[PDB]
């Protein structure tokens, strides 16, 4: 059956994935024991009668978190050899994963995918989940995504990245790890959903009115985005859009494929109780500088493509009138050469919800994914953070000492400089 | 030391003595 | 009807056979005392293939046990299903071929062949018309590798229009039982290629690898490992005993596998191989049975099959499975893995659908395959022979008992030639 | 004295069943290797020759030499055709009347004519096992 | 009176014919016992009082397929003497089934053939079922068919050959077994109908719309062709044929007797609602290339002779309506020298349906056996499998050691070369 395969690389994507498959088990009504008391075929297989198994792979070089999945809730619902665990973590080094220690898992991983991908054709895409700044996510993420490009050249493969924020970085080697990542994650990938962490920090504090959150609420909130993204693959509706025609609509040219997200509504049971989330305002909150999830003001950039999956009850009248209102807004400027910019999606299934989490049941949701030129300074910000540290060779010898060469760092310089050059070339 | 055997052939399964058409 | 005589030679053969007869007895449902319970015609209609009635309703197996030292023959007597064998079937040597092929074959063995041929033909003429033999020996030791290969040569000339298949354990790459390993193997291969029709290779360390990985057992004893050979060595001969759609036989797969008579050394794989933990998390179907059976870490010979190309390969499926799902998949793998097979044989693969699945399990396959990947394995035994011959190490323990230095020179020539044909046929 | 196994319990047999057909009594014993050999063979033979057609051409009355109520109930729980009653002295009467010694004698089929006296002896303690069908159910049908 | 004696040799022969006989028993209301609660003369004798024993013989060198019938539900249906079992299997050798072990069966089998043919005068023919790639299917088949030609002079010989596939083979010795059979099949049989296996796999995939049929579903469809073939002998019709007229219907030269098959309708009971089966529509499905039972593309084939046996309530003129439009159509290409190329016979009684089968009860049915020049593809492909495998004498010593003379494989190929050229010569 038509299907999509999931890949989780590193500490970031693993517990995102923990938040991911928690919902999908609840969405399809299967208990953690693994049994329920055709729609799920795109994410879950069958084991005998009544038992459903996730179609995902986990991949990390250290067992301290892979073991945390296995001895947790999902002892029986998962598969034992579905989780892949190495010996030593790459430890914030692009060189440790991509060059030395990764090779012992690649041969094991390639064989896993090949055994999962070949059985049924009509497969659709892949789903990476990794942090750009972490070493395994950047390192071991790359060589796996490199090898898949050579083998299945014909095929879509989505990326989900946790880009470093302007203030919060959670590591000293983030500028090195990132600029090295995107050189080898521009060419190999197709579409990469950029996300920041401090964006969602101020999301939790403003709308969802909690003053200091942690990772189990960040992953709970990105899991609602991905479930709203890919419900169209799972369930039916009046109008659905899948993986393979995101790239058709949103990617005008091969380089410009790094885009943002926004989700409306983000409201607790405090205010889900207290007002309409009407189509005339959930789209207003979607375009607000607050609700976007990639920490840059769209005022100092130009929108070029937008994709709006309304999920829940919207009758078509309200979409189209709300859309026409947004053209009239002067503050939001499209690029002049692109008259069409919106690719509406209306689903009929109501929005999902975790049990006991902060996310409220809302009657209708919008998940907006946005190709904009506001990424221009976000790339130049990391370029400037590269320029400081590279100026006199700090923390280079760690990468060089592992097996890399000085000089491929330079090659990434004109690679990212070309990427910032393209955005300023396109956006005029 | 064995429990009772419960695989059955496809030939035994389906070609049994059908009623004749009248 | 049709009879298969079992001969067990050496220490390894006698141990491996005692577990084999356990698998057959409870596949047919026979109480270790010999009597019958299970109440099914279909497991019983072909029972003369291995057993004989003995006036108590009981079934005594057509197995002869041979060894040159009486140590391990009381081991099988005292142990499980020891009550089943015939005390006349035991033949004792009181001396012991101490890992010396010379005394296994020429000097010490010659005065015991006069007894072991007695019991074999006593069981041979008892039926109407014999079909074949099967012999379990290891080509490491002395009372299996030399004392067994002489019994191979004697019963072959007496009954030349019958067949035999020998389940043989070879040397290992790194770890090494029986330090005079390459002497006993090479001297036996150049006799075994001349007098035996089919030989299933087994290595300890592909077999150590399987129980570490798939079965997930930290401390593997001999009992559990022999239980893994005995199921395969039961699977190859299911079809003689139980009906099916596309039947098979030893001679059916004897002619279908070997192109030319001198290369008949076969690999074994079996599937499914599931631990306790992953038993409930596999959804057993014909697709992943084929993907399990074509896996480099699944075959029981320590050769990576990806180096060579499969020449001819057979699949004895076992159970009620649908038949395009059978045939279309062997087509699938032969077309998908175009580089893994040999171009000059159209339809490389072979199939068989045996209609009764193993006990408790539901869908099983037993993969036998004539690969060319034994290029590297026999060239391994070859250079180990050359390493221990130029210095002339450990030669005195052989030469002093009527051996000849000419025998070793022919043995290497007669086995480096077998390497020649594997490489020749790409 | 002669019971038929139904769904639930046992029932006394109706004596007009035995007419118009052929009758054999089956002397056997649980826990014998040869009896476990022969019981399913006669099962399949019975079912084939009786249900390959509209009505019954043969039937079997099973008589046991077992030493326990438990083993008797055990075999009767799964044997399809008739049985005799354990406590009825007809069973021991049939033994001494028909010459089974209570080995090389069990199992046995004694095919009986309409006069209660034998129309055939058939044994299995021999090399041949194609001997079930050597018995005509065409000369000896009871009136 | 008038009858046809059927022979089953080899395993493929036995279990196809095991399905063929259980179809015939319920056609005439014969119980598996063999009694009944002037139809049955042509396939049954009468024994004593109330019985019907078949006109058949089972031969195999292995007990395993024939004794299993002896204990099946068809115990007293067959007389226990024409069921013949050897001791050991022929084991995929032409040589072994022809030279060594094949001798000891023909000496008793020909006697039973004589026993069955000596009842009444005017034998119609011999329907012998066999596989071609098999061991006993060829070797025992040849020796029996050769002896029958000399012993009985002028009676017809129908031979349904389970031909080796264009794609699958399920044995390695198939090109050596198939070619050698042909050199001993040309001058013995009179009508050799070629049947395939994955064609019926492909038929049951598309038309029958059932996911997982087995050999038991292959054989029902095969049984349905044979019943419609000999429908004319058993029952009266508006326009009848015979089995001794087919060779005068189909063969233009004595060495060309390799014909295909077709059948319609072949429909599930679930999709039967969407097809009111008319004579106009069933005939077109008969000529549609993805409905024939041989798997050769006829678009490169010039048709030469065709023989349609209609079954059931069909009136003569809508047949004449259908065949008028068929001939004028240029997708079904006839050769020049044969301007008339149809025989269409008609029988009254509509086809039975087996209980527990996969066929809806239909009211009319068409069965086709046609001579075409597409068989040049079936043979020139086969010749390619031979010489590539005979390039350096693969598997030779098995045939040499069993009794054949090395070099007999040459004139077998020279024979098949002539059969290759005359098809090419005819088509111009």
XYZ file of N, CA, C and O in Angstrom, chain A residues 49-140:
368
model
N -2.865 -10.969 13.538
C -4.219 -10.445 13.596
C -4.375 -9.537 14.810
O -4.360 -10.017 15.947
N -4.493 -8.233 14.535
C -4.779 -7.247 15.565
C -3.543 -6.482 16.039
O -3.684 -5.440 16.664
N -2.346 -6.992 15.726
C -1.099 -6.365 16.130
C -0.547 -5.492 15.007
O -0.422 -5.960 13.880
N -0.232 -4.239 15.350
C 0.276 -3.274 14.393
C 1.648 -2.797 14.826
O 1.868 -2.484 15.993
N 2.544 -2.746 13.846
C 3.932 -2.454 14.133
C 4.317 -1.155 13.437
O 3.922 -0.894 12.312
N 5.029 -0.238 14.116
C 5.472 0.991 13.457
C 6.456 0.728 12.317
O 7.273 -0.189 12.378
N 6.353 1.554 11.281
C 7.297 1.509 10.179
C 8.251 2.689 10.261
O 8.069 3.710 9.587
N 9.235 2.544 11.151
C 10.224 3.585 11.371
C 11.567 2.906 11.636
O 11.608 1.707 11.923
N 12.656 3.674 11.511
C 13.944 3.231 12.005
C 14.502 4.297 12.934
O 14.395 5.493 12.673
N 15.116 3.832 14.026
C 15.846 4.685 14.945
C 17.331 4.454 14.735
O 17.734 3.342 14.395
N 18.112 5.514 14.939
C 19.526 5.439 14.639
C 20.273 6.447 15.502
O 20.073 7.650 15.400
N 21.167 5.951 16.353
C 21.976 6.779 17.243
C 23.234 5.998 17.600
O 23.205 4.762 17.697
N 24.328 6.727 17.823
C 25.598 6.063 18.062
C 25.779 5.646 19.520
O 26.675 4.845 19.817
N 24.958 6.205 20.417
C 25.080 5.841 21.819
C 23.797 5.197 22.322
O 22.701 5.605 21.927
N 23.899 4.196 23.225
C 22.705 3.540 23.737
C 22.005 4.210 24.917
O 21.118 3.598 25.504
N 22.380 5.437 25.300
C 21.834 5.916 26.569
C 20.397 6.407 26.412
O 19.740 6.698 27.397
N 19.997 6.619 25.157
C 18.707 7.160 24.787
C 17.945 6.122 23.965
O 16.721 6.130 23.981
N 18.650 5.266 23.218
C 17.987 4.210 22.471
C 17.422 3.200 23.475
O 16.335 2.667 23.292
N 18.167 2.938 24.555
C 17.693 2.106 25.650
C 16.533 2.757 26.384
O 15.705 2.059 26.974
N 16.502 4.087 26.341
C 15.459 4.812 27.035
C 14.107 4.619 26.337
O 13.090 4.580 27.010
N 14.105 4.456 25.007
C 12.917 4.082 24.243
C 12.503 2.647 24.570
O 11.334 2.348 24.739
N 13.478 1.754 24.679
C 13.157 0.338 24.740
C 12.612 -0.063 26.098
O 11.734 -0.852 26.151
N 13.153 0.456 27.197
C 12.687 0.046 28.519
C 11.547 0.958 28.975
O 11.053 0.857 30.088
N 11.162 1.929 28.150
C 10.053 2.825 28.478
C 8.694 2.165 28.267
O 8.505 1.011 28.625
N 7.756 2.922 27.683
C 6.386 2.472 27.514
C 6.318 1.401 26.427
O 5.616 0.405 26.564
N 7.045 1.642 25.327
C 6.967 0.868 24.097
C 7.906 -0.343 24.137
O 8.747 -0.579 23.278
N 7.704 -1.173 25.156
C 8.480 -2.403 25.235
C 7.949 -3.446 24.267
O 8.742 -4.196 23.755
N 6.643 -3.455 24.009
C 6.042 -4.540 23.252
C 5.541 -4.054 21.896
O 5.435 -4.852 20.963
N 5.140 -2.777 21.806
C 4.543 -2.273 20.571
C 5.605 -2.103 19.474
O 5.301 -2.295 18.296
N 6.844 -1.762 19.865
C 7.956 -1.626 18.936
C 8.502 -2.994 18.537
O 7.953 -4.030 18.876
N 9.606 -2.976 17.782
C 10.353 -4.163 17.408
C 11.767 -4.028 17.960
O 12.320 -2.945 17.952
N 12.377 -5.107 18.484
C 13.718 -4.991 19.067
C 14.822 -4.583 18.097
O 15.574 -3.688 18.409
N 14.902 -5.223 16.924
C 15.953 -4.932 15.965
C 15.607 -3.711 15.104
O 16.386 -3.320 14.237
N 14.445 -3.108 15.360
C 14.044 -1.860 14.732
C 14.863 -0.689 15.261
O 15.047 0.292 14.552
N 15.400 -0.816 16.475
C 16.196 0.242 17.070
C 17.671 -0.127 16.881
O 18.102 -1.219 17.221
N 18.480 0.805 16.397
C 19.889 0.565 16.112
C 20.718 1.410 17.081
O 20.451 2.604 17.286
N 21.637 0.731 17.775
C 22.452 1.359 18.794
C 23.909 1.005 18.524
O 24.245 -0.162 18.294
N 24.747 2.047 18.575
C 26.183 1.903 18.443
C 26.874 1.739 19.790
O 26.317 1.227 20.756
N 28.110 2.216 19.831
C 28.966 2.077 20.992
C 29.342 3.457 21.531
O 29.054 3.711 22.708
N 29.946 4.348 20.710
C 30.373 5.657 21.199
C 29.658 6.789 20.446
O 29.564 6.718 19.234
N 29.157 7.821 21.150
C 28.503 8.976 20.529
C 29.514 9.825 19.764
O 30.663 9.884 20.168
N 29.072 10.493 18.695
C 29.939 11.341 17.884
C 30.388 12.587 18.644
O 31.429 13.158 18.319
N 29.579 13.020 19.620
C 29.960 14.063 20.563
C 30.329 15.378 19.869
O 31.459 15.839 19.951
N 29.347 16.010 19.231
C 29.468 17.347 18.668
C 30.644 17.510 17.728
O 31.328 18.516 17.758
N 30.859 16.489 16.917
C 31.930 16.488 15.953
C 31.344 15.953 14.660
O 30.850 14.826 14.631
N 31.382 16.779 13.613
C 30.957 16.338 12.295
C 31.852 15.204 11.796
O 31.398 14.307 11.081
N 33.125 15.245 12.207
C 34.098 14.274 11.733
C 33.891 12.888 12.357
O 34.270 11.876 11.753
N 33.333 12.850 13.581
C 33.236 11.572 14.272
C 32.175 10.672 13.634
O 32.369 9.457 13.512
N 31.069 11.281 13.193
C 29.991 10.542 12.549
C 30.256 10.259 11.067
O 30.201 9.114 10.619
N 30.524 11.325 10.302
C 30.590 11.269 8.847
C 31.832 10.526 8.328
O 31.895 10.156 7.158
N 32.865 10.421 9.186
C 34.136 9.870 8.735
C 34.507 8.575 9.441
O 34.781 7.584 8.777
N 34.521 8.579 10.778
C 35.109 7.451 11.481
C 34.054 6.483 12.007
O 33.989 5.344 11.565
N 33.258 6.908 12.993
C 32.558 5.928 13.807
C 31.221 5.505 13.200
O 30.666 4.456 13.609
N 30.733 6.315 12.239
C 29.448 6.076 11.588
C 29.371 4.818 10.717
O 28.257 4.302 10.532
N 30.533 4.368 10.185
C 30.641 3.344 9.143
C 30.119 1.985 9.644
O 29.626 1.156 8.865
N 30.195 1.764 10.965
C 29.769 0.513 11.589
C 28.246 0.386 11.664
O 27.745 -0.710 11.895
N 27.540 1.510 11.499
C 26.088 1.522 11.560
C 25.479 1.649 10.162
O 24.383 1.126 9.975
N 26.174 2.269 9.202
C 25.644 2.533 7.864
C 25.316 1.231 7.165
O 24.250 1.117 6.567
N 26.244 0.267 7.250
C 26.021 -1.001 6.581
C 24.828 -1.710 7.221
O 24.059 -2.393 6.531
N 24.672 -1.540 8.542
C 23.537 -2.114 9.255
C 22.261 -1.345 8.905
O 21.204 -1.961 8.803
N 22.366 -0.024 8.724
C 21.187 0.799 8.520
C 20.649 0.617 7.100
O 19.434 0.459 6.958
N 21.546 0.649 6.081
C 21.226 0.514 4.658
C 20.431 -0.775 4.428
O 19.551 -0.863 3.581
N 20.875 -1.825 5.112
C 20.247 -3.116 4.948
C 18.846 -3.104 5.530
O 18.011 -3.846 5.018
N 18.611 -2.254 6.553
C 17.319 -2.185 7.225
C 16.294 -1.541 6.295
O 15.158 -2.065 6.165
N 16.716 -0.405 5.711
C 15.864 0.364 4.818
C 15.546 -0.454 3.583
O 14.381 -0.480 3.189
N 16.572 -1.106 3.026
C 16.434 -1.887 1.810
C 15.462 -3.029 2.030
O 14.724 -3.410 1.110
N 15.490 -3.566 3.262
C 14.567 -4.645 3.556
C 13.170 -4.073 3.791
O 12.174 -4.745 3.548
N 13.072 -2.808 4.216
C 11.770 -2.167 4.455
C 11.180 -1.528 3.187
O 9.964 -1.408 3.074
N 12.030 -1.113 2.235
C 11.593 -0.274 1.115
C 11.167 -1.109 -0.089
O 10.314 -0.719 -0.891
N 11.801 -2.275 -0.224
C 11.703 -3.054 -1.450
C 10.386 -3.818 -1.544
O 9.972 -4.142 -2.661
N 9.774 -4.142 -0.387
C 8.715 -5.143 -0.311
C 7.463 -4.683 -1.052
O 6.879 -5.447 -1.821
N 7.094 -3.420 -0.820
C 5.966 -2.823 -1.498
C 6.430 -1.554 -2.208
O 7.073 -0.688 -1.618
N 6.141 -1.496 -3.507
C 6.396 -0.255 -4.205
C 5.237 0.701 -3.929
O 4.348 0.468 -3.108
N 5.289 1.841 -4.600
C 4.334 2.873 -4.277
C 4.630 3.527 -2.915
O 3.703 4.031 -2.247
N 5.922 3.530 -2.541
C 6.439 4.203 -1.373
C 6.486 5.667 -1.761
O 6.516 5.966 -2.942
N 6.485 6.584 -0.798
C 6.276 7.974 -1.185
C 7.463 8.885 -0.884
O 7.826 9.759 -1.672
N 8.013 8.676 0.296
C 9.062 9.547 0.766
C 9.658 9.007 2.048
O 9.247 7.966 2.594
N 10.658 9.754 2.501
C 11.296 9.454 3.758
C 11.222 10.668 4.642
O 10.981 11.760 4.163
N 11.404 10.416 5.931
C 11.277 11.472 6.902
C 12.483 11.428 7.816
O 12.498 10.589 8.701
N 13.398 12.382 7.622
C 14.501 12.567 8.542
C 14.012 13.399 9.731
O 13.118 14.291 9.637
N 14.635 13.101 10.874
C 14.445 13.911 12.060
C 15.794 14.052 12.739
O 16.260 13.096 13.337
N 16.389 15.240 12.672
C 17.716 15.423 13.231
C 17.914 16.890 13.597
O 17.198 17.771 13.107
N 18.879 17.129 14.499
C 19.372 18.466 14.781
C 20.570 18.758 13.872
O 21.476 17.922 13.704
N 20.578 19.972 13.308
C 21.678 20.436 12.484
C 22.905 20.573 13.391
O 24.022 20.203 13.027
N 22.697 21.055 14.617
C 23.850 21.445 15.401
C 24.494 20.251 16.116
O 25.697 20.241 16.310
N 23.723 19.236 16.511
C 24.264 18.031 17.117
C 25.110 17.231 16.132
O 24.939 17.263 14.927
N 26.029 16.442 16.643
C 27.032 15.843 15.788
C 26.539 14.614 15.068
O 26.781 14.504 13.883
N 25.756 13.785 15.748
C 25.258 12.578 15.115
C 24.187 12.914 14.087
O 24.126 12.297 13.019
N 23.319 13.869 14.443
C 22.273 14.341 13.556
C 22.846 14.955 12.281
O 22.274 14.795 11.204
N 23.944 15.698 12.421
C 24.629 16.297 11.289
C 25.528 15.271 10.589
O 25.533 15.182 9.361
N 26.334 14.557 11.380
C 27.289 13.591 10.858
C 26.596 12.388 10.230
O 26.545 12.265 8.994
N 26.046 11.532 11.100
C 25.535 10.248 10.661
C 24.251 10.413 9.852
O 23.931 9.555 9.011
